[PDB]
Ligand binder design. Sequence first.
Ligand SMILES: Cc1cccc(-c2ncn(CC(F)F)c2-c2ccc3nccn3c2)n1
Length: 303
Amino acid sequence: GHMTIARDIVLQESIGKGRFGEVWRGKWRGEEVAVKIFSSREERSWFREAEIYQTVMLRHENILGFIAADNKDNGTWTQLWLVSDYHEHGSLFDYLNRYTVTVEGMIKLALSTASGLAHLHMEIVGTQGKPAIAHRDLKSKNILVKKNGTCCIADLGLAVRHDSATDTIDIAPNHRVGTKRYMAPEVLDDSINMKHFESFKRADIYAMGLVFWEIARRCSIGGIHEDYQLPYYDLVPSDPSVEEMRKVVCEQKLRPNIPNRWQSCEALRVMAKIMRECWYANGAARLTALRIKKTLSQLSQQE
Ligand SMILES: Cc1cccc(-c2ncn(CC(F)F)c2-c2ccc3nccn3c2)n1
């Protein structure tokens, strides 16, 4: 047996959680892996996440490397496991909280995030085809940072997949499923047309703009940077409700503040412009992940 299976994995350290499930660092045949553990009553969440990660042609350097879905019976109860690559830096949230980044560092984090999202959103029609996938819960706590300073998107459990041939979404989607702070205006005010798959891709773009803002604040030039904050830290309380978010984002039409200092640097000007073009209230006006990837690729080439 060359494939990775739960019985051959030994848990070493508690490394936080997912939306559901508790995450552990484990060792499998001398290698470190991440293990997310679900109880038997969470089978639906575990299965749906296993199903998304097993999507044909999903693997990409900027998408969390999925290893296996398995069960582990300890003799008393059964644990439902998801196994993935382990990334020592943890989340982009943790990384931005601990460190400031250089201009190069910022571009690498933003471009790799956009590249993973472009891959997730991309449909490949035909044999061994890949359905377009929308995340529905993109945020800095759901992105991991690799040793090479690039990102990979994770926590795909709330994802939705599109079948173009039938023009259907694989599940009956519930309203407002993600993290309230990052919900797009149309999700907050429930005007989103959930029968149109493009609506979910657009809502992901809004959330990515918020993540770019979080990264840009940590970009240090001449030792000048902003402290770590979540988007809307200045307007909403911790654990904000849908109503608190909707009043700020939909009624007052506010977005995270773009500081004056971001105009003094070309990379920061490009980043600020992408943010504004992710934050439009009208989802159809927003940039695509593919267009953002191309813009940031052009910027990394120049740098
Ligand atoms: C399919 C699967 C298997 C195992 C873990 C996870 C996972 N879910 C949420 N997070 C946290 C964030 F990434 F969303 C992780 C996760 C993944 C890798 C990792 N390395 C260091 C900490 N890590 C946490 N997912």
